[PDB]
Subunit: 243 residues, 5 copies
């Protein structure tokens, strides 16, 4: 039933400040310039509408930095990761957490008379340009399969009706939050990735809390870790890494 | 229903004593001055009513030191964490645990006729100056969503009755313990943070054990790790880190 | 009931790029040659039909490279592992995950009249030459033993009818995905290893999602981590490891 | 209902033998003497009945050495832990596990007519001199709160009845084992620490197994890790650390 | 009911091949001689009937090598571990897993008229010479205590009738597999250790899978990690560690 879009990598890293500070100044500046040159490649790709990327600083110890990358193939995600790891800066960007998934759409008007992969209204959700909002939030999730709270043993109808209320709660946040749903069954450790974008970080809390009182989330939601962060403008990269 | 206040970062670190002891004395002393100068900034900010902080040493191996930081924005939490990590001392303050949340209030008298964010008796709770008590305790919590113990599937009335008892247990500790509840749904791994402040650390055990016999806690509480600590005022920092 | 074929090791590693970069160029190049010489022995084994192997790069941080090795004995698995670990490159290939299992068949026409280990259509499944597809997916699984969802408490009849739906789902993916099932009860921490091979990675998500709606998976599936990757032919090894 | 006694730290460490062996011999000897000098302080404290301590070597890889420390305040535990960490030997005593708790008594003859914190028969239990038995066992515990097995939702009277059999099983081991119960609700990750002391390590297994058939343990016990050790007389410290 | 025999340490290590390769050749040779001289002491002890041991290489990343040691006291396990760790080789044998337990016998013909500890046929099993088989398999287990599957809430007769089936599955592997059961209630993290010895590793998978269909295992079995290895003859040690 779902339409699949761009592959997605969330690549979180922790900064080894102690090691970075021992690198001579000239090698640090070179490393920053090298990394900025890489991101410039990403920006050209995003300008050509052949992928997208978001770079946020993450608050707390689960990570310091998120690179969220959308590309048309799994190979390209691998290529990006590898290029990143071969930069000098990446030596100081230790592993923290990662997620591999694919942009997934279930909600669209299906007529049968068109290839939806060629319809503009659909493509712009399949192949999204990521929002450049002040804040981001990521978490992965499963649908529960435990006792009488087993999502996958429900009827289609029952699932549809449960998902109605979920949609209704989302509608309350129109123009306040945007959500990128990626599917990861068969690709990583949970079933979906949820990435929220907002200019107001409080809306992540309002929205995710309000959702939790809908039956689909209360009885069927299993959630992983939540990562929240602030946009890192590429103009601020040098000062962020300045020591 | 809740009013949201300052953002909160609990940053817990373990001290790499062995490495620290290798750093030349003059450089340890310079690192301590550099750290004190940073906390001195935090103190000015608190004095200005533009945030608050608490610094405690933590007993046992889960951590050695806690920095608890309240600020108006998530950006300022990022800035503080980054500033801290760029200090020399922070090289020896290894990751242990962290929590990101926002001061949250549900109980206030709501009339309609005023903006509660401008009422003094509400503002002083949203934007608290943290207690300077001998001891602190932190733990995170969820409300349970399992089987027949699913908080989010209850009625509003059933939750309100359950929370009654909880409120009444708390009243018993008026003047003995203060509790700062932060909400982290959508922001970190559990649903709430709970920070307790008392001049008698036994009060933490008394209070949390007593609460556990209230139905809300017994049936619906899910608890993370508990961290307990002793105040580390800045005048004691030099002696604590001295080797 | 099951026929057992070649033992299997899945050996996943993460690359210590920082340390590798410090190794002088001439020694990195000699390490890559040594490693290729090793894989060339594996290829000789496989062309003699005395085992098989695959080498994939893995996307994300759970691992960077997978060596999947099939051999006639557990000893040979130990000798391969040991010989890999004594290469120079392996010093930079840090532990990430591993799995030990044996190729297991339940599906064959059993007539009584032949030794199935001698039948060519059985042998080619016990002792498989692994697919050289663009992509791979690995996950382990258990059959659930919880409450009223206890696979092992069912009747033989109930298990058979359960597994018939599961086989029907698999049939939909004929010629799009091939699946190697290894058994690991008594050998590793889960009960089966599942390795999927496809030239379209989306087919992993499609297949594994679709299966999750079969009662057998919905009620009785317990899954470990999912690792996805892209093929690493030996001709691409020098470029992949180049710095 | 409970009376509270001394605070308790269990500090488990693993020995970094490889590093220890690199340290110059005259520095190892000084480090041993420095450590013994610390323990001499602990011994003066214990002689004055203002704390107690136990030092055991722990079998297996969960730890190598346990320092169990009882002191009148939480601050004193922090001071002891900090002094220990500032010794040279502690550089080689890596983190393994720790537990923070308070000696707790439930069972005592309550007259109302006296302050039981001043009664000799109670004081010797609140403020125990730890036994110098050949062996020790430590484990933490919670009382279950799951489904129909919820300790905290029982009546007082149901709890009292359950604890009766538990008391009866203990009475069987009079003279053979002694048990220090410490409460950690609000202080660490489980609800109680259990420390058993015996001259016969088999009695740990006999006792803990027999307890497990009591309904209170079978239905409501949840156990952490178990750590068993042999007494390290201070006269054997130099030989133990000799390399 | 149970008779206890020798104490048992399972000590698993991972080899630090990178570090070992940097040690000069002469120091490696000396370290191998030193280790071989240690195991010669163990061989003498076994020959005097005062203990037993087994040394196996473990396949996969959970470990590389297992030393399984039986001695009459826990103190002797401590001594052996300490002596091992003080060898040069052990600096390169990093922590992986460990288990501390005691050989435990429930099944024996009890007359009343003899001290069973003095009976040949019982002593043979309390104080066993470990099998010198081609392969070994280790895992720990608990008996479940969850909901309606609570082993310790059954009657003695219910347990008896459940264990009967278990015994009958084992009898099917007479002469194929031998099993050393050690009890660890009160001593380590699970309730029993299960060590299996066979000259055909496939028999581990057959036996353990067949058991899982017995009600006692299906409903009451909780398993830890499974480690499988190949015998390491002392004559092969030099080759194995040769770099
Ligand atoms: Mg890295
Ligand atoms: Mg750091
Ligand atoms: Mg290695
Ligand atoms: Mg330390
Ligand atoms: Mg070691």
């Amino acid at each position: 039933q779902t339409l699949d879009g761009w592959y997605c990598l969330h690549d979180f890293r922790t900064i080894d400040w102690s090691a970075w500070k021992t690198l001579p100044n000239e090698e640090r500046e070179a490393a920053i310039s090298e990394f900025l040159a890489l991101v410039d490649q990403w920006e050209t790709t995003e300008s050509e509408k052949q992928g997208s990327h978001a770079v946020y600083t993450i608050v707390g110890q689960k990570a310091d930095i998120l690179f969220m990358i959308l590309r048309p193939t799994l190979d390209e995600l691998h290529e990006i990761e590898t290029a990143l790891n071969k930069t000098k800066l990446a030596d100081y960007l230790l592993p923290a957490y990662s997620y591999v998934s694919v942009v997934e759409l279930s909600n669209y008007l299906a007529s049968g008379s068109e290839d939806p992969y060629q319809i503009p209204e659909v493509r712009r959700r399949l192949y999204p340009i990521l929002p450049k909002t002040n804040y981001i939030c990521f978490y992965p999730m499963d649908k529960r399969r435990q006792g009488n709270d087993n999502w996958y043993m429900l009827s289609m109808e029952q699932r549809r009706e449960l998902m109605r209320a979920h949609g209704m709660t989302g509608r309350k946040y129109a123009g306040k939050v945007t959500q990128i749903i990626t599917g990861s069954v068969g690709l990583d450790d949970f079933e979906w990735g949820v990435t929220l974008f907002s200019d107001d970080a409080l809306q992540f809390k309002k929205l995710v809390y309000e959702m939790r009182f809908d039956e689909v989330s209360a009885r069927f939601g299993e959630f992983g870790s939540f990562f929240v962060g602030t946009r890192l403008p590429m103009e601020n990269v040098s000062s962020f890494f300045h020591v």
